[PDB]
Design a protein around this ligand. Structure first.
Ligand SMILES: [Zn+2]
Ligand SMILES: [Zn+2]
Length: 582
């Protein structure tokens, strides 16, 4: 308690000693509340004008246009501690899982040099701006690294001063850039060294890319077993128990020297005890604390979510196979049985899953899994939009399963070769490309973001008639040599000035392990579309009058955007499609 958090709290109180007070009408029940001080301040969504001018039919589609307008009453909730039988299953499974992930990997510290390179190439690290302006600036100063050096030696002493969360179905907890360095130094290896790649973790998909997820779901479908289950959890981050945080900390058992101590300190001082500043309009700054729930950097959060999800789903599979009978207490021979299951079939049962953070697909041995709910509910991983004791509804067709906000189609090329392609409702794809994050964007920067969306559509969504046409239009409207950009950077093969047909061939043919015949595709016309009815089912405007006018008059929209940007070198990509090829 206050021995671990006091120092952080005391230090803040003293920077606002002119403002402190224990407000008696604080809303917190489940958070520990400490005090309050004086502040005043808030980045809403802006429209990308290049993308919107080239998608005019969508100006009248509420699903597109509403996306651009506009539970912190779930962050204030508590989870009960699991039963003793549940706690035993989780500790045995976690122990075994860290050993498996470790067999072919070596834990290691990430470097100033690696972190400095991350900020300089614009990753979304989720830090606060104060003493320096940007993230770039503070990285190029030595005073910073003294603050870092100071906090670091405090961590080795088992103490914390400056590692505080700032709060803001999402809630991003920004930390100061220094606190993010020390997290990245201790636990960056999980992401940097691909601990959750498919090859290493068997259930994981870290770094696989959207062009491989469909093929991975089809490979899971090839296994003998029951339906495919894809239950979402209601607010996963809010349901992470202190027992979860302690089984995650067992990765430190594979570490040594300084690393082991630095990683134990992140787990002990920042994760298993947390200090958070919240704004309350009633504008005060509330200093609250608690022990449980997820608050890490977004990237370490991904890896630990994947780990704990993999653990939860193996246990649900154990329950369906009848490996154990009660969660109240594990007998001694029930333990031996669980350990024996893990050693005997654990790796085969991991290969039956696809897991991305809080998101999962499981093809269990059979449909007993559907009603195996006691361990899952008792671990606090309660399923979204279904009654707590109602059996899961599984999918019988891999092409209908949802995963990472997508579904996957089987698409046969004119030469008989088989693509497995990602897809989602086209309104969602167009509404997102029409949004820019943050203010102060030049026309040039707005255009380069449009071009990033266009190249992603050509690579991932080429099979949607409206997106191949809009992607060609945007790339015709933006100067040919201008480089695609993004402010919060899966694998991103569309982020290049290389020719998109050359990239398409590399991604879908050359480097695609499910394609035996490596014959290159010579033109965009060899590359197929979904059937027209399927394209409509997934939101195409093909067949509407608005869409026909747009398509027919596309050169006029392209010319409007070229005139705004000015006298630059442009390419006409529209003749890459049959209907504009004269
Ligand atoms: Zn600290
Ligand atoms: Zn679709």
């Amino acid at each position: 308690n206050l021995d671990i958090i006091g120092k952080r709290i005391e230090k803040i109180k003293q920077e606002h000693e002119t403002s402190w007070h224990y407000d008696q009408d604080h809303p917190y029940k489940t958070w520990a509340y400490h005090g309050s001080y004086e502040t005043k301040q808030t980045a809403s969504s802006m429209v990308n004008g290049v993308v919107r001018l080239l998608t005019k039919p969508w100006d009248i589609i509420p699903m597109v246009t509403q996306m651009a307008m506009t539970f912190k009453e779930k962050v204030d909730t508590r989870t009960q501690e699991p039963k003793e039988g549940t706690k035993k299953l989780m500790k045995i499974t976690a122990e075994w899982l860290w050993k498996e992930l470790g067999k072919k990997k070596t834990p290691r510290m990430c470097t100033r040099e690696e972190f400095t390179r991350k900020v300089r190439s614009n990753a979304a690290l989720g830090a606060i701006f104060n003493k320096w302006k940007s993230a770039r600036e503070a990285v190029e100063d030595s005073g910073f690294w003294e603050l870092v050096d100071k906090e670091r030696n405090l961590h080795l002493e088992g103490k914390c001063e400056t590692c505080v969360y700032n709060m803001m179905s999402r809630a991003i907890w920004y930390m100061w850039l220094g606190a993010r360095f020390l997290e990245f130094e201790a636990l960056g290896f999980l992401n940097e060294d691909h601990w959750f790649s498919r090859e290493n973790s068997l259930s994981g998909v870290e770094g696989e890319g959207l062009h491989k997820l469909g093929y991975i779901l089809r490979d899971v479908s090839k296994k003998e077993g029951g339906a495919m289950y894809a239950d979402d959890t209601a607010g996963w981050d809010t349901r992470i128990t202190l027992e979860d945080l302690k089984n995650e900390e067992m990765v430190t058992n594979h570490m040594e020297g300084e690393h082991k101590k630095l990683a134990e300190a992140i787990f002990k001082l920042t994760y298993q005890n947390k200090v958070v500043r919240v704004q309350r309009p009633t504008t005060v700054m509330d200093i609250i604390s608690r022990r449980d729930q997820r608050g890490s950097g977004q990237v370490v959060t991904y890896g630990l979510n994947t780990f704990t999800n993999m653990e939860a789903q193996l246990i649900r599979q154990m329950e369906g196979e009848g490996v154990f009978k009660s969660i109240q207490h594990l007998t001694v021979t029930e333990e031996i049985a669980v350990k024996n299951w893990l050693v005997r079939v654990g790796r085969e049962r991991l290969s039956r899953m696809a897991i991305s953070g809080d998101d999962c697909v499981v093809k269990p041995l059979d449909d007993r899994f559907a009603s195996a709910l006691t361990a899952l509910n008792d671990m606090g991983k309660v399923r979204k939009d279904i009654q707590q004791w109602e059996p899961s509804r599984g999918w019988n067709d891999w092409t209908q399963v949802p995963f990472c906000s997508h579904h996957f189609h089987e698409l046969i090329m004119k030469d008989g070769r088989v693509l497995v392609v990602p897809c989602r409702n086209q309104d969602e794809l167009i509404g997102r490309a029409r949004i820019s994050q943050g203010a102060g964007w030049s026309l040039r920067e707005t255009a380069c973001l449009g071009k990033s969306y266009a190249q992603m559509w050509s690579l991932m969504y080429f099979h949607r008639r409206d997106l191949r046409l809009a992607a060609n239009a945007i790339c015709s409207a933006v100067p040919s040599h201008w480089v695609p950009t993004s402010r919060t950077t899966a694998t991103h093969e569309w982020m290049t000035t290389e020719d998109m047909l050359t990239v398409w061939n590399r991604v879908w043919i050359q480097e695609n392990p499910w394609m035996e015949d490596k014959t290159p595709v010579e033109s965009w016309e060899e590359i197929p579309y979904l059937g027209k009815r399927e394209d409509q089912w997934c939101g195409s405007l093909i067949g509407l009058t608005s869409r026909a006018t747009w398509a027919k008059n596309i050169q006029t929209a392209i010319n409007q955007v070229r005139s705004l940007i000015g006298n630059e070198e442009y390419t006409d990509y529209m003749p890459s499609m049959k209907r504009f090829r004269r």
